[PDB]
Amino acid sequence: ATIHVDGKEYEVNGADNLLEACLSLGLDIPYFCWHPALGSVGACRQCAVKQYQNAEDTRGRLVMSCMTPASDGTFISIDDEEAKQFRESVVEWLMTNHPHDCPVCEEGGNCHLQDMTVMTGHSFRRYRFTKRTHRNQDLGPFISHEMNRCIACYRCVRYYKDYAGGTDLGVYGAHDNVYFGRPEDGTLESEFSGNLVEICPTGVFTDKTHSERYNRKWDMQFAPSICQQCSIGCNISPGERYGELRRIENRYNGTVNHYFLCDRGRFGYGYVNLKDRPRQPVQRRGDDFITLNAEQAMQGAADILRQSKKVIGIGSPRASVESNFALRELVGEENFYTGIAHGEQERLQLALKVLREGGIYTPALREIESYDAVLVLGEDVTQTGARVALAVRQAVKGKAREMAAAQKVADWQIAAILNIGQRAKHPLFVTNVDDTRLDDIAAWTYRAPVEDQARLGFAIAHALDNSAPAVDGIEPELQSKIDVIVQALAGAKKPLIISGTNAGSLEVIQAAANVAKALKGRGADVGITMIARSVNSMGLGIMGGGSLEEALTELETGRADAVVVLENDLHRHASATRVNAALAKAPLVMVVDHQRTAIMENAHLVLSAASFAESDGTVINNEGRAQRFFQVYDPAYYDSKTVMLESWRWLHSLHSTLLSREVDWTQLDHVIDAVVAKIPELAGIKDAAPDATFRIRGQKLAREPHRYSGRTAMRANISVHEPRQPQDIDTMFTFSMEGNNQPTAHRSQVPFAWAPGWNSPQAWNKFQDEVGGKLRFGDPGVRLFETSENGLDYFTSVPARFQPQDGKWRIAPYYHLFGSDELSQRAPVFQSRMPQPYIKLNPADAAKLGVNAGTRVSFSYDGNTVTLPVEIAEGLTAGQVGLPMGMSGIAPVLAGAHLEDLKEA
């Protein structure tokens, strides 16, 4: 199209509204109620521009730019006096009841309302009457509530209800007494309640975890990183102050996690600030855990490895590509073992084979929202890959969007979208051992054991295409439901099959692969998504290695007398007794870790590794996209005796000391080159981010904002002499003010969004090419593998029915967003949000044992009896028993396994 803004010609998209078209061009228009993801409602009355009918018009007409489409030849004015007077008046009306709270408000310096008050030029108050006040509700441990600061812009209710699909946040009252919150006191039950701290333009919803140890946005040292709490790999901005990780802000990625994270990845960062973490290397001599610096620890470790007959290495899916590869070089690729069990590794390798050899295009997380039918097989998406569940909700509302678009309604008229789309929505068929959080919008939910879920998928694949292996033993009404699912998937333009490794069944993955292949063979634009468990599970699968059982047999037989455990607690993937016995038999245990685990008591040496906040590296997400995360802060800047190095740095210097008897603290780009030389299937991680020589017109990228304060006084209590600015030889970033964070800088790794006049999270509008689109100069991250030309073949191994045998109980995994990822359970703010460990039972099974709800029953697995209180699950099937995966004592490896001696305590 063509618009005339103050006489200047501009070329914009004709389908866009005028506010987003003018914001894409860099023009500044105040706005509150419009969000790029939530659509438009036109409440705040802030985006007024004067539109003219033709080229020569004097009076014009004041119009709302978030309702006005950017049609061809549209003449508007922004800076003329009438529009500025109206926008200043609207800001003034918002400022009548606003509390005098900016010094004691967590949004100060990060406030959209402050930015728009300053931008409109309104600074003189002529209101002398009283201001309305509101009582503050309790929203739980994550979100702090303060309703005095609200401007009634309706963004919270729009996001939480329409977008996030929540049910316990609403607007109450009329006129100026509108109240936004829950009907009563309680925790916000949505898994994406944390995004309200960025959706809300004011300080109504604030980060309570940040509020405990609060600092302003200009004082925060930011870095671009990847969230380490599940396999989705949402881009984040961890920001620190005074040596502790303070906040996790959302980092815009137009491909993955544009405006939204989940609650686990926003509030589960508290394990970094734990005081029991190893900070210096520790050697156990006799029973004395003495403390070394880096050099003597490396020398002694290299010696004690040098007179050992065989050294094995147990990596982890928590660790990065570089650290696992450095361990692989240290011990040799024959003696390198992945830290996961055999069944988990089999499921992970099958998921990788489906992704990179199945011939079906795996979609990006932003691209999930543009699919017409979703079949989720076996994966509890909301509890394991929650952001994928949010994107699935968007794809389900896509039917209402399409129905509105068929009747001359644009995509930003979300009110008309919901008016036309009353209750019609895209088909969603979720399958699990119990009820999920997607069942409120799902067209069908199938509660069945994982064998029966796999059989459902196999029957769907056979009904879609007769070349798939058939299933015998389908009940007729279940067959009618298969026909309904097949009719929904066949009529869809873009179907999407979502599975993963969390179900604990290979056959569900095989069934999802066969459904995707059958839909591909009909000519549909089918996509397949696979949810892995940990942050770098796909990278560990691509790198490969032996399973944990092989390493345990090597330690127990005596062929290996030296074990190097990299960032693995070893109890989540194997039984505790076997791991403890194997590590007790081994005369040399060396744990390279950043979290105090149970295996460090048996460890002979502990290398204090760094977490994601104090290290760089590359992680591969569930879609196969390599993503680089950078160090946020130097740990030794505040505590000089802290020796907390990168895991790959520790292992590379250990290998160098073992070989040539000197320490070699390498550079990250050297390890990247070693990975892309030794491992050609990981050769794409070089393009994930540019190397340390990357500059923007000669200068590096600044970690901290321009107004970083206190630099001559933040360490003055230790010494009045200012220390060294920490030098970053690994990355293109600097630990200082002196860098570049321009929105027009030719770069993709943006540490934080800030623009002059835009201090809120709305500065991402300045950092994007067009608002709500991609990051300018491309989104960061690169896919490792392309879609294969030829696919796989149909998996003929159709599993049998689940037969409940007496005395044996099938463990059904019940994942929790707060409690399954180990590092998140380490966080102290998650210990109040997580539920108490309850064992889930069928009513028929509870009647058979004669136990009621809440009774403590004991069960013995691997020779250890543990007691749990019983919760009655109606959606479970008979012969199964529900257990919470990931909690203390209940490893996620227990999923899909039998359980013995289920009796009342």
Binding site: G42, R45, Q46, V63, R126, A152, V178
Partner: protein, 146 residues
């Protein structure tokens, strides 16, 4: 709807006839205000009804009708200050058809602008004290604006 005077009484009740008369036909159920009822209290009650019964969706009506209500409350008690009638005109100009989300607020401030246009002398009688928005802070010299 807008208030009208005795000069507008000799005018037929149609749609277009009241269209250029500066008012609306409405429901054609008129109400007469005599000399005993002061227009300040009447406009205060009208705006109080239109503010407590507004829907509160969009910013200008929701956050400006209470401002006009408080201004009229001050003018009732004689606590008006210089900068109140101009505030009423600015609010009415910024509350026109399409300036708000719907037409409830233009109908809300039609009586306000009508009583301003025809009975401005009854509203200026409520302005008695000078404009004092700030209070003196001991230790800080105020900026004497001119």
């Amino acid at each position: 709807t807008d208030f009208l005077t005795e000069a507008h009484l000799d005018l037929p009740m149609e749609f277009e006839s009241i269209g250029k008369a500066g008012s609306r036909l409405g429901t054609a159920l008129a109400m007469a205000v005599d000399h005993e009822i002061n227009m300040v209290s009447l406009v205060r009650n009208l705006e109080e009804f239109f503010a407590r019964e507004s829907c509160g969706w969009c910013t200008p009506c929701r956050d400006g009708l209470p401002w006009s209500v408080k201004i009229l409350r001050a003018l009732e008690r004689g606590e008006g200050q210089p900068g109140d009638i101009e505030t009423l005109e600015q609010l009415c100009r910024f509350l026109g058809p399409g300036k708000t989300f719907c037409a409830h607020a233009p109908g809300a401030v039609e009586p306000l602008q009508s009583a301003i246009k025809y009975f401005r002398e009854e509203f200026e009688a409520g302005i008695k004290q000078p404009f004092s928005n700030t209070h003196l802070i001991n230790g800080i010299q105020p900026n004497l604006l001119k």
